[PDB]
Ligand binder design. Structure first.
Ligand SMILES: CCCCCCCCCCCCCCCCCC(=O)OC[C@H](COP(=O)([O-])OCC(O)COP(=O)([O-])OC[C@@H](COC(=O)CCCCCCCCCCCCCCCCC)OC(=O)CCCCCCCCCCCCCCCCC)OC(=O)CCCCCCCCCCCCCCCCC
Ligand SMILES: CCCCCCCCCCCCCCCCCC(=O)OC[C@H](COP(=O)([O-])OCC(O)COP(=O)([O-])OC[C@@H](COC(=O)CCCCCCCCCCCCCCCCC)OC(=O)CCCCCCCCCCCCCCCCC)OC(=O)CCCCCCCCCCCCCCCCC
Ligand SMILES: CCCCCCCCCCCCCCCCC[C@@H](O)O[C@H](CO[C@H](O)CCCCCCCCCCCCCCC)COP(=O)(O)OCC[N+](C)(C)C
Ligand SMILES: CCCCCCCCCCCCCCCCC[C@@H](O)O[C@H](CO[C@H](O)CCCCCCCCCCCCCCC)COP(=O)(O)OCC[N+](C)(C)C
Ligand SMILES: CCCCCCCCCCCCCCCCC[C@@H](O)O[C@H](CO[C@H](O)CCCCCCCCCCCCCCC)COP(=O)(O)OCC[N+](C)(C)C
Ligand SMILES: Nc1ncnc2c1ncn2[C@@H]1O[C@H](COP(=O)(O)OP(=O)(O)O)[C@@H](O)[C@H]1O
Ligand SMILES: N[C@@H](Cc1ccc(O)cc1)C(=O)O
Lengths: 122, 56, 44, 347, 104, 320, 49, 53, 458, 98
């Protein structure tokens, strides 16, 4: 099953609709971005190790490019993910609003009027 | 001469620095859960003539 | 005095064409070191 | 083979897959499959020897039968509804034939026998291509026609694929056949969740492709095709064996590694429907794949096997060709679980 | 060769007391050995053990044992003064409870 | 730029650099014969690069610095103790033979790479096609087992089939008594123990297997002891050979491209020398392997890649 | 010390190093600018400031 | 799965041959042109699930 | 509680950046400092837990477990550096990295607020343990041990995962506070029975339950000393902690689903105590001891009373300390004589008096001499079982008789009698080993001085 | 459906069964593949002619083209197999197992 492929108004290969510009962008200190940079740093260290170079000191420009590329991709990935979750919430709330018969708010009962069975432990 | 001493024993600040950073991050996390500060039925209180918040 | 490590007898368990050999597959041979079977003399 | 001709053939393979992925007409999808197969046959025969020829012949026979069944299903669908657009597949007999043809193309059980043989008969680069790129087109078609699928048939084939992959992989000492049985089990996992959520299918496919690329690239870096030849790598380059061990653990699905993420997600999706027994069976069966991965890790990284004298000479030389994407592939194969919610971007 | 493989012989175990009669069993380097002993003894016994025990012994009463004792004292005094029972079998007021209408 | 598919696609072709004097030459002969001097003279006269015979430490001379390493970390075999105790129960004989075959394979790959890269010819003393004679002389004397011969044949079968045999094979024939006289006049106390049966076995292997089978690939130039000092006559005999019968004329750009990709990447050259066949003579236990590898990695210029060893004076590492 | 050329010499490949550093710096500047414009557009659309 | 390259670029690579009611040469009509036209106009824009009923 | 998590993650690069001959010193010093910091978690409330954030919380049940983990890391480091002297620097750093990663996973496991995060960390603890066992174990059986350790665990935990996600589709949350406040009874249906089994069996195999315990002697005998320490002291308590967490949603089904497990626990406690009487390997005896004590803990958790829960908490802490000390004591003799056979080296009191005193104190705490916290936990569990049924005092009573026997048996075999004549390589005890024994034993008696810190939230 | 449609479908099924059941010659199986292609051509042509789908009239020709490609591919492989064994028997393709 595909939930969102046929959602009306969806541009085939956009990756970032204009509506997404109404959402707050992720901060540059977002922990997910920090973890993506950490993944880039680990990639650089593994690159040094495989090539039989000093792991921590061999190429600083290469490691910098690794970290920068991972952060650069992660920013847009996070933007798209947040947009998709916002879309899901928007559609859910609109559907609940447009079908009140399927989502009734029934009368509230307090615990002084609800009979719950008691199971003793012995 | 402190160059050799530093380059031999600079690994001894990593764990204290991590402790301080963890304390700072815990304070930051506490900063995001103030939705009921001075609002519970048990602890709701009138503010003093000076203090701004009941806890940080 | 030292940690045990695999020897030749241990390593030969994985050198066959198959694990858990049976009577049928005991005659299966491992592939050649390079994947080149010797050429047959199928003279025409 | 000329490098120009090899590049042209690889581009034609990719073009056939892309034509399958972008087409709206059933005839163009079938043409994409034909072009992909026609360009793929010589790539499997690049290093000429009898085993490669046998593998190419078996692959051609399987894929040609699958394409004939595909075309017959298309024609039956046209007969009962004059439609060429890839859609809800208005006829059930045609849909059954279509499902069987796509399963035969993918190598799902019980049309699984050709995968270990073709993988063993070709080189490691050809095996990488066959087990990574060749899954995209049939899975794309199956995702497009998922709403008309019969869940009983696909779930039966997926469970059979998982079981057969585990059992067959338990018996192997050749690394290519191990990879082929692992591929069969992972295809079973991919197709088990397809009638419920195609995003989970895409996520599983991406993670499997990343792990398989890392595995094959590590196997090419250390020129090993058997367990015993891989047991020498520790005495030449231990870093490669350690990275291989972690990658094998990830392929086994252990938390907190990335290979745990798809199964987890798939299991959750299956419990959003009722579907309780099948996910439990699937996990308990994936334990077999974990077992033979662990046996490989025992042979190559966690213990030290005896070596040979001539290995000393190999100590004096370095690897000439370097794979630029291997470190990123390893990192994505291992440390990606904390970014799980990003899967929302897949739908 | 009547052998199976070329292997190093299993070596004898080294006694740390031979090269260092007062060796503490931490390292073969005498200075590193001595300082390992010193740091283990200072940070294990002097810091964590004694100071941690003192810190735990004087932990403030967040379990509210003394508060509960004082509250119980006030309650007992009041109830004994007014002649009420010390404790009630009901911990919730029945006027705030609505039983089901029919039991038949 | 490193040679590869990209270099072949645009420009670079091997067939144009061949200028009628490529002519891979090998100069075989028995022990203590003057084949090395003849090879040096041939190389000097024809302007080709001379490769001295590959010894135990041939690989050492081409990696790191050209200085040899300790016998424990390279070779792990001795020719002197092979002469002293050829029937030693520690496997020295076949270990030495296998290491020497691997060294010869490496040298042949180096020579082929040089010839295909520059178009200049090469002159070798012995080759992978000629090493087997010593192995035969080892087996007929009882110095090695039959399983060692089987392993050697397997390795040769999977290795020597990927290269081109030499254009012209030059042989120097010296009788066994003359060889014994030369050895006695030499003075090396380890070579005086060479029995005449060993030399006769080497000569029999040569004259009954190597020359007959090499004569089918190309014509063989045999010279006696007296007509090998006159090197100019040998050279002018080489200069008038009709070389159009072997596999060398059956080579085009794509086969040369494949061979050139193979001759570089010495790891791919040596791939099949360490096949997991567990002969006691060449199998090394895990503990010894670990100790010896740790010892090797601690050599002054060996821990990292060639340009990344700051303990031998490598600068600007943190930008490389 | 090395018997062979070791094509990577004592000095680093300046062209590659410059290209790598320039790519990293350009990507960082582009990311900063894009984040600034994104914040501005979000504030404008939602009318915070 | 399906990358709608044709829709994104407006290319019409193969849509001209998907249905029988779409611009035949010389305006030759299919045997069931009207029925297909009516079904397509009924089912347009409401999705497969609703169109099936 | 990032003030504890971040310093361990900093231990990682501090170890990997240290000078080759300073790794042990730095690791030990900063591990002890982290333990001192974690000591502050013992300040607990009487009503609710310390809810640090949306992700981590501390209860009166998990705080002593965290303190035990952080205290066990330096002891493991001290015990490991003797037999790893010949190792290369990189492999020593890798071993220390495995230990640090295990500590991090355990710390995050004991404080996770959600059940799926708890599951992920509680499975993540598997990898470092398996690597340690199969890479640094001494004998060829370690490989088999590793396999037994892995699948026995996973065959229990894979069903649990399914159940967990199923629960989240039914109630909407796996947060433990929400789960506790919004608790609803479990009806008596086959579906509920299988949900109960899926929720219970993973923790049962972790304890381990008698009949599912075969992995433990193998894994705890074949492991290196630090592996055995962390397996006996902390990793067995994951099952008990998880069971006490998960039982809040299983009532009133437990009322009758506990019978087979209660019978297995009591009878198998008798059985494993009896097995300890005829054991030729000294490490296997300690492993079977752990099995018996954990059977007691299982009974306490299954009967579901406040006294049983307090006893279970106290017993887990006390057993962790005592079993780790016993494993270290056996390892000293093994390093001296290179054999695990108990009757090989005898009369060791004549040669090593202070080590004999350590042996006596460890065996005294094993048999639960009053007023040790071992005895406090055992007595609380026995009293709760007596309330559950008066006949239990029979089986429990028999256990108390057998335990002491085998405990003293062990002592009498190793320390008393006459020394073996041909063993002439028994060197005097090092300062490191005596310090290790003291750092094990002194916290036990200090905790006896203030027992409410290990009695749990009840 | 008319009887002719059932006959063409039966022909396709027969050709598929013939392909799936090998005797000895690879050439016979290739012939069965060609027969399946021919049956598909006939069936599609009959459907397209019956419904007067004008633009679909080019579809069968396209089918034939790729049939030829498939036919060529098979023949090429057969040549190599024969050159290895002196025969085209499927029994000889047994170097690789499961
Ligand atoms: C969860 C929380 C967060 C955790 C994150 C996840 C874990 C960490 C990240 C993982 C990736 C990072 C490292 C990747 C590259 C490492 C590859 C490597 O070989 O390392 C060698 C390298 C040493 O090499 P060298 O210095 O050139 O000289 C020694 C020779 O090379 C001698 O080398 P050799 O090759 O000759 O030696 C042979 C050796 C070589 O083999 C290895 O070294 C194994 C390395 C494998 C890499 C890991 C695989 C891929 C990552 C997946 C990890 C999964 C984690 C999840 C849990 C599951 C565990 C598997 O092989 C063996 O000896 C066989 C041993 C068999 C044991 C098998 C166990 C292997 C798997 C264990 C993995 C555990 C995680 C990583 C451990 C740390 C590794 C350094 O190690 C390092 O020094 C690098 C690590 C430290 C750098 C980071 C420090 C940052 C800067 C300091 C300041 C900190 C800033 C803080 C901010 C505040 C300001 C004050
Ligand atoms: C009860 C008297 C109270 C005295 C007041 C002050 C006591 C201060 C003790 C502080 C803690 C002891 C340190 C533990 C490590 C052992 C020291 C060592 O390594 O030896 C080197 C040291 C150097 O001598 P050496 O010439 O080199 O000879 C060494 C040779 O290896 C051979 O050496 P050895 O042949 O002389 O044997 C060493 C000794 C040391 O071995 C031990 O067994 C000592 C460890 C205690 C047993 C642990 C398991 C029992 C569980 C109970 C836990 C109680 C802890 C309470 C809180 C403690 C706070 C930290 O073992 C024994 O002598 C026989 C042990 C049989 C004890 C039976 C008593 C059972 C409980 C009775 C009452 C306990 C609660 C009191 C309140 C009750 C209500 C009023 O040895 C000594 O100096 C003699 C040790 C003194 C014996 C203490 C036994 C009574 C104390 C029990 C607990 C203390 C309660 C204090 C609260 C006030 C009452
Ligand atoms: C194991 C780790 C997995 C990593 C996989 C590779 C990661 C690197 C690849 C980078 C992707 C490049 C894409 C960016 C260019 C823009 C292309 C854009 O136009 O495509 C959009 C599509 O967007 C992409 O799908 C998003 C790609 C991002 C994938 C990452 C999710 C992985 C799951 C979470 C694991 C953590 C990942 C960490 C990253 C380092 C169009 O959507 P649409 O045409 O309508 O979809 C067609 C298919 N449908 C309709 C059936 C759905
Ligand atoms: C070698 C020679 C040995 C023999 C010679 C010894 C000489 C004499 C020394 C022996 C002293 C005898 C002990 C007698 C007890 C006196 C001290 C006692 O009174 O203090 C207790 C206090 O003890 C501490 O509370 C217990 C210590 C805490 C234990 C934590 C250990 C540190 C952590 C180490 C690692 C953790 C590993 C275990 C994980 C769970 C009482 O607490 P409390 O009744 O309230 O006090 C009420 C008043 N307050 C509250 C205001 C203070
Ligand atoms: C080696 C140690 C491994 C770990 C040990 C795990 C222990 C698991 C044991 C499970 C305990 C009980 C499970 C289910 C509770 C009752 C079981 C049954 O015997 O009781 C009767 C059940 O009646 C009959 O016995 C029907 C069940 C018979 C079929 C079950 C197969 C048991 C045979 C033994 C197979 C061994 C299983 C373990 C394999 C290792 C009760 O009658 P009834 O009131 O109607 O059923 C209650 C449920 N209702 C209310 C929904 C209807
Ligand atoms: N494959 C081999 N096996 C054993 N010994 C060899 C081998 N190749 C060369 N040698 C030894 O090298 C020594 C001298 O080599 P040779 O080329 O024959 O003499 P020269 O140095 O005068 O040219 C001889 O003692 C010979 O035994
Ligand atoms: N669960 C118990 C723990 C406790 C035990 C003893 C105490 O003194 C205090 C607290 C409460 O009450």
């Amino acid at each position: 099953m595909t939930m969102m492929s046929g959602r009306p108004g969806r541009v085939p290969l956009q990756f970032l609709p204009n509506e997404a510009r109404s959402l707050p962008p992720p901060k540059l200190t977002d922990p997910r971005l920090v973890y993506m940079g950490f993944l880039g740093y680990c990639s650089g260290l593994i690159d040094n190790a495989i090539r039989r170079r000093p792991v921590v000191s061999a190429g600083l420009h290469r490691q910098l490019l690794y970290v920068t590329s991972f952060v650069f991709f992660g920013y847009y990935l996070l933007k798209r993910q947040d947009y998709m979750y916002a879309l899901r919430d928007h559609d859910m709330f609109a559907y609940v609003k447009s079908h009140p018969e399927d989502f009734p708010e029934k009368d509230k009962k307090t615990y002084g009027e609800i009979l719950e069975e008691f199971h003793p432990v012995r | 001469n402190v160059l050799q001493i530093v380059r031999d024993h600079w690994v001894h600040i990593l764990v204290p620095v991590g402790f301080v950073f963890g304390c700072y991050l815990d304070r930051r996390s506490d900063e995001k859960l103030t939705a009921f500060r001075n609002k519970s039925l048990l602890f709701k209180r009138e503010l003093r003539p000076n203090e701004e918040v009941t806890w940080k | 005095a030292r940690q045990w490590q695999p020897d030749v007898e241990w390593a030969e368990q994985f050198g066959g064409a198959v694990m858990y050999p049976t009577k049928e597959t005991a005659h299966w041979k491992p592939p050649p070191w390079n994947d080149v079977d010797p050429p047959k003399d199928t003279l025409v | 083979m000329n490098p120009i001709i090899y590049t042209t053939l690889i581009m034609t393979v990719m073009s056939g897959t892309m034509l399958v992925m972008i087409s709206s007409h059933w005839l163009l999808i079938w043409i994409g499959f034909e072009m992909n197969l026609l360009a793929m046959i010589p790539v499997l025969m690049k290093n000429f020897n009898p085993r490669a020829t046998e593998a190419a012949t078996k692959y051609f026979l399987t894929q040609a039968t699958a394409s004939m069944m595909l075309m017959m299903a298309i024609i039956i669908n046209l007969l009962y509804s004059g439609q060429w657009t890839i859609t809800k597949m208005f006829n059930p007999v045609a849909m059954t034939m279509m499902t069987m043809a796509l399963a035969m193309k993918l190598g799902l059980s019980p049309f699984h026998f050709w995968v270990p043989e073709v993988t063993q008969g070709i080189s490691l680069q050809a095996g990488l291509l066959l087990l990574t790129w060749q899954k995209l087109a049939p899975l794309s078609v199956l995702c497009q026609i998922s709403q008309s699928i019969n869940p009983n048939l696909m779930l039966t084939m997926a469970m059979l694929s998982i079981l057969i992959g585990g059992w067959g992989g338990l018996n192997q000492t050749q690394l290519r056949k191990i990879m082929a049985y692992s591929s069969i089990a992972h295809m079973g996992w991919m197709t088990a969740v397809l009638p419920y959520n195609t995003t989970m299918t895409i996520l599983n496919l991406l993670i499997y492709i990343t792990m398989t690329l890392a595995m094959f690239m590590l196997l090419i870096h250390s020129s090993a095709t058997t367990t015993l030849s891989l047991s020498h790598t520790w005495n030449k380059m231990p870093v490669i064996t350690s990275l291989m061990m972690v990658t094998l653990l990830s392929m086994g699905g252990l938390p907190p590694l990335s290979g745990f993420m798809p199964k987890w997600m798939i299991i959750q999706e299956m419990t959003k429907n009722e579907s309780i027994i099948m996910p439990t069976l699937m996990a308990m069966t994936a334990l077999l794949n974990l077992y033979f991965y662990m046996r490989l890790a025992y042979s190559s990284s966690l213990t030290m096997f005896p070596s040979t004298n001539n290995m000393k000479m190999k100590w004096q030389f370095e690897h000439t060709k370097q794979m630029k994407l291997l470190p990123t592939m390893i990192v994505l194969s291992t440390l990606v679980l904390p970014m799980t919610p990003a899967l929302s971007s897949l739908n | 060769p009547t052998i199976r493989l070329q292997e190093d012989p299993d070596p004898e175990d080294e006694n740390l007391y031979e090269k260092n009669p007062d060796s503490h069993g931490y390292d073969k380097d005498p200075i590193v050995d001595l300082w390992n002993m010193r740091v283990v003894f200072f940070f294990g016994f002097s810091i964590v053990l004694v100071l941690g025990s003192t810190f735990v012994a004087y932990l403030p009463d967040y379990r509210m044992q003394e508060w509960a004792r004082r509250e119980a004292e006030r309650l007992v005094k009041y109830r004994e003064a007014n002649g009420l029972p010390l404790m009630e079998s009901n911990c919730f007021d029945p006027n705030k409870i609505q039983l089901p209408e029919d039991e038949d | 730029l490193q040679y590869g598919p990209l270099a072949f696609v645009l420009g670079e072709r091997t067939t144009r650099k061949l200028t009628e004097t490529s002519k891979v030459i090998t100069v075989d002969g028995n022990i203590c014969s003057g084949k090395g001097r003849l090879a040096r003279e041939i190389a000097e006269k024809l302007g080709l690069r001379h490769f001295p015979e590959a010894g135990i430490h041939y690989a050492d001379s081409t990696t790191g610095d050209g200085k040899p390493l300790d016998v424990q970390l390279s070779g792990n075999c001795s020719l002197e103790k092979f002469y002293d105790d050829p029937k030693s129960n520690d496997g020295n004989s076949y270990r030495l033979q296998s290491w020497l075959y691997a060294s010869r394979l490496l040298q042949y790959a180096d020579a082929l790479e040089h010839l295909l890269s520059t178009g200049q010819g090469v002159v070798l003393e012995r080759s992978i096609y000629s090493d087997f004679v010593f192995l035969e002389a080892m087996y007929r004397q009882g110095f090695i087992r039959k399983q060692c011969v089987e392993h050697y044949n397997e390795v040769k079968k999977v290795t020597a089939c990927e290269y081109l045999p030499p254009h012209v094979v030059v042989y120097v024939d010296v009788p066994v008594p003359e060889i014994q006289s030369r050895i006695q006049k030499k003075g090396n106390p380890h070579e005086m123990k060479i029995t005449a049966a060993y030399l006769q076995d080497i000569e029999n292997a040569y004259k009954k297997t190597f020359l007959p089978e090499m004569s089918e690939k190309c014509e063989v130039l045999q010279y006696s002891a007296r007509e090998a000092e006159d090197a100019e006559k040998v050279v002018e005999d080489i200069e008038y050979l009709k070389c159009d019968k072997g596999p060398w004329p059956d080579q085009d750009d794509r086969t040369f491209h494949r061979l050139r990709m193979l001759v570089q990447n010495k790891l791919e050259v040596l791939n099949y020398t360490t096949i997991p066949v567990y002969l006691p003579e060449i199998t090394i236990g895990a503990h010894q392997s670990d100790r010896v590898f740790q010892k090797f990695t601690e050599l002054p210029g060996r821990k990292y890649s060639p340009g990344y060893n700051e303990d031998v004076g490598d600068k600007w590492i943190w930008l490389k | 010390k090395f018997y062979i050329r070791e094509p990577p010499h004592g000095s680093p490949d300046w062209l590659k190093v410059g290209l790598t550093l320039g790519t990293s710096v350009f990507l960082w500047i582009y990311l900063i600018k894009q984040h600034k414009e994104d914040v501005l557009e979000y504030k404008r659309r939602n009318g915070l400031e | 799965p399906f990358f709608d390259v044709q829709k994104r670029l407006g290319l019409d690579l193969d849509r001209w041959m998907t249905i029988q009611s779409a611009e035949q040469p010389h305006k030759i009509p299919g045997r069931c042109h009207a029925f297909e036209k009516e079904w397509i106009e009924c089912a347009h824009g409401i999705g497969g699930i609703r169109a099936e009923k | 509680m990032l003030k504890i998590i971040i310093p361990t993650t900093m231990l990682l690069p501090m170890t990997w950046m240290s000078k080759h001959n300073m790794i042990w010193i730095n690791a030990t010093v900063h591990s002890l400092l982290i333990s001192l910091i974690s000591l502050s978690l013992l300040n607990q409330l009487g009503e609710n837990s310390l809810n640090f954030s949306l992700t981590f919380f501390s209860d009166s049940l998990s705080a002593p477990l965290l303190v035990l983990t952080t205290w066990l890391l330096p002891l493991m480091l001290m015990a490991s550096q003797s037999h790893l002297s010949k190792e290369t620097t990189t492999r020593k750093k890798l071993y220390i990295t495995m230990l640090i990663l295990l500590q991090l996973f355990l710390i995050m496991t004991f404080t996770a607020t959600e059940l799926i995060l708890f599951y992920i960390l509680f499975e993540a603890t598997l990898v470092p343990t398996l690597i340690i066992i199969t890479r640094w174990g001494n004998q060829t059986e370690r490989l088999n041990a590793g396999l037994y350790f892995l699948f026995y665990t996973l065959a229990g935990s894979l069903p649990l995962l399914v159940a967990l996600v199923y629960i989240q589709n039914t109630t909407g949350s796996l947060n433990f506070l929400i789960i506790h406040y919004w608790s609803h009874p479990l009806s008596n249906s086959w579906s509920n029975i299988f949900m109960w089994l899926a929720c219970i069996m993973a923790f049962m195999v972790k304890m381990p339950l008698y009949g599912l315990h075969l992995w433990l002697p193998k894994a705890h005998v074949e492991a290196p000393i630090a592996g055995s320490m962390v397996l006996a002291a902390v990793l067995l308590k994951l099952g008990g902690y998880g069971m006490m967490r998960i039982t809040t949603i299983l009532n009133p089904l437990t009322n009758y689903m506990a019978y087979p497990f209660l019978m297995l626990s009591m009878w198998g406690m008798i059985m494993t105590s009896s097995i300890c009487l005829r054991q030729t390997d000294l490490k296997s005896l300690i492993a079977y001891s752990s099995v018996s004590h954990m059977a007691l803990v299982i009974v306490a958790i299954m009967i579901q009373t406040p006294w049983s829960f307090m006893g279970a908490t106290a017993l887990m802490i006390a057993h962790g300390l005592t079993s780790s000390m016993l494993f270290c004591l056996a390892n000293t003799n093994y390093e001296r004589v290179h054999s695990r056979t108990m009757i090989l080296a005898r009369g060791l009191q004549t040669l090593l008096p202070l080590m004999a005193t350590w042996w006596l104190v460890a065996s005294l705490t094993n048999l639960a001499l009053p007023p040790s916290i071992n005895l406090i936990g055992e007595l609380f569990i026995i009293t709760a079982s007596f309330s559950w049924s008066n006949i239990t005092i029979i089986l429990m009573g028999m256990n108390m008789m057998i335990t002491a026997l085998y405990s003293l048996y062990m002592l009498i075999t190793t320390q008393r009698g006459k020394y073996t004549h041909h063993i002439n390589n028994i060197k005097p005890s090092f300062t490191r080993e005596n310090a290790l024994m003291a750092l094990h034993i002194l916290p036990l008696l200090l905790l006896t001085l203030n027992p409410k810190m290990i009695l749990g939230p009840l | 459906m008319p009887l002719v449609y059932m006959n063409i479908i039966m022909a396709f099924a027969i050709a598929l069964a013939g392909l799936l059941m090998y005797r000895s010659h690879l050439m016979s199986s290739l012939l069965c593949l060609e027969g399946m292609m021919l049956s598909l051509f006939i069936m599609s042509t009959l459907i397209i002619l019956n419904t007067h789908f004008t633009l679909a009239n080019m579809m069968p020709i396209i089918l034939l083209v790729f049939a030829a490609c498939e036919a060529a591919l098979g023949l090429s492989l057969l040549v190599m197999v024969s050159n290895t064994y002196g025969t085209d028997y499927v029994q000889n393709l047994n170097l690789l197992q499961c």
